[PDB]
Symmetry: C11
Subunit: 67 residues, 11 copies
């Protein structure tokens, strides 16, 4: 499955956390105002963290992260 | 399957419990106010605990965890 | 599948029962008031018992344990 | 698949019946008033019997056992 | 798949019929008034019969079996 | 998949027809008035015939066989 | 998947046509007035024809064959 | 998957088209007025053609073929 | 999965395009006025083109091609 | 999965992009006004572009490309 | 699974991110005004970024990226 994230303000970060015994950030994707990323869960990513002002859509609804 | 968690106050803990014969915390992710984590159940994680004020969405709807 | 459990009072116990020929508790997770656990059925867990005051959500609706 | 059972009064019994050519009770789980159990069908359990006053939820709706 | 059976009178019988070339009763579970059984179709059971007054729920809705 | 058949009169027959190149009755289950059978299609049964007054429930609705 | 067929009159025929390179009737089930047959598609049957006055239910609704 | 076809007039044909590199008619099933056929897609049939006056039902609704 | 095409006028063509590295017409089925074809995607067909006045039904609704 | 595309004007192109490490046009199908193409994703095509004035249907709803 | 993207202004980019331990842009697809791309998640693409004004449709509904 995947998540849809739209940056509402500049410098939002979409961060992938490692799948496995260890849980660490493997990548932080910077999103500028207005850009959208559609990101899956994958072999390497089993949790996604969102920081900054953004709108998130999933199967379960919408959620806004805040600055 | 996955859970969506938005921190409504600072220092919310998202805790992964170990899959298998033993049940112990293998990781606690700290969220500050306004941050969101989308987390799956996995080979290593078969239970997830939320401590602190947060809005939770799952297949089953919404659940609020309360202020610490 | 999984169950969502929210503790309404302090001292709620979420207990996992062993999958297999034998049925014993293998783990009791204590929840404080306001905490939420999302717990799957697994290789080792085929029944979950809730004791104490709590709100439960499953694929079939909501249920309350009391006291 | 699984069933959710809330005891509405004391000494509700949730009984697992053996999967296979033979059908006997392999376990009877005592449920006190206000407690909840969520139980799966499993390698060892292919029928579940509920005795006592209880609320039961399944994929097919709600049932109340009486007594 | 499974069936939900609630006995509405005493002595309701929930009968499992054998899967395979032969069709015979292999087990009859007796239910007293108010008791509930949730039973699956299995390797050994491919037809289930209810005799006696009962409410049945399946993937298809409700059916009542009548008083014996 | 399965069918739910309730006998509305005495002398209802639920007949299983053989799966394979040949099509023969292999079993006729006689149902008394008010009894209900829930019968699967199986390795040995690929068609089921109902004779006598009965109510049939499937995934597609309800059908009444007539006296 | 399966089809439900109810004979509205005497002399309804439910015919199975062969799966494979060839399309031949392999069996015709006679259905008398009021009788119901519930028949699957199988290894041997990949088309079913109904002749006579009858009511048919499928995944796609109802259809009436005429005498 | 399957399709349900009812003949509204005589001489409706239900035609199976061959699966594979070539596309030919392997068989035409004649349906007389009021008869109904329920026909699957199979190892041999990957398209179905209807000719004559008929009502067709599939997963996506109803379609009428018309003769002449 | 499949498409339903009904010719509303004479000389509609239903064309199968080849699955694989190359994309060419491998077959053009001519449909006269009033005829219907139900056609699958297959090992050999990964795109279907319709030319002429016709009504099309898919899982996603109806579309009309125009002559 | 597949996409349904109807040309509302002359000159619509339906373009397949290559699956794999590289992303290149492997085929451009020209659609004239009123014609429809139903196209799948396949071993060779993992993205499809539509250029010109056309009505598009997917599992997700309707979209209009502009001239 | 796939996403539908329509460019509403000129010079929109649809960017694929690499599946695997590393996260890089492997390709930017230029989408000019009014054009539509329907793009899958694949062996090589596990996240998609949109830069510029566009309408996005997914299994979850609509999202707009901004100018
Ligand atoms: N490394 C962890 C990451 C993770 C997924 N879901 C979680 C929930 C809580 C804590 C960590 C996680 C895992 O793959 O299991
Ligand atoms: N180690 C346990 C964790 C767990 C999941 N669900 C539970 C319910 C109750 C108690 C523990 C659990 C297991 O994998 O089975
Ligand atoms: N040890 C048992 C646990 C169990 C699951 N569901 C039950 C219902 C009733 C009694 C026991 C159970 C086994 O896995 O089956
Ligand atoms: N041992 C039986 C238990 C059972 C399941 N469903 C039933 C219905 C009727 C009677 C017995 C059963 C079995 O595995 O098949
Ligand atoms: N022994 C039979 C039992 C059965 C199942 N469904 C039926 C319907 C009708 C008659 C008998 C049956 C079988 O496995 O097929
Ligand atoms: N022996 C036939 C039984 C059957 C199933 N569906 C049918 C429809 C019509 C006639 C016979 C049948 C078979 O297995 O295919
Ligand atoms: N023997 C044919 C029977 C058939 C199924 N669907 C059809 C549609 C039209 C004509 C014949 C058929 C088959 O297995 O493919
Ligand atoms: N022989 C072709 C038949 C076919 C199926 N669907 C079609 C659509 C158009 C043209 C031909 C076809 C194949 O199996 O692919
Ligand atoms: N030969 C191509 C045909 C095709 C399918 N979908 C398309 C979309 C656009 C262009 C070509 C196609 C393939 O199998 O991939
Ligand atoms: N060659 C790429 C094509 C592609 C699919 N989805 C995309 C999204 C963005 C950019 C490129 C693509 C692949 O198979 O992965
Ligand atoms: N290379 C990463 C790309 C990715 C997918 N989803 C993500 C979410 C956050 C950060 C990176 C990603 C992966 O395959 O796992």
């Amino acid at each position: 499955d995947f998540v849809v994230i739209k940056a509402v303000e500049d410098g939002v970060n979409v961060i992938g956390l490692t799948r496995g015994t260890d849980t660490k950030f493997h990548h932080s994707e910077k999103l500028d105002k207005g850009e959208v990323i559609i990101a899956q869960f994958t072999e390497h990513t089993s949790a996604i963290k969102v920081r900054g002002e953004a709108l998130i859509q999933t199967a379960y609804g919408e959620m806004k992260s805040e600055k």
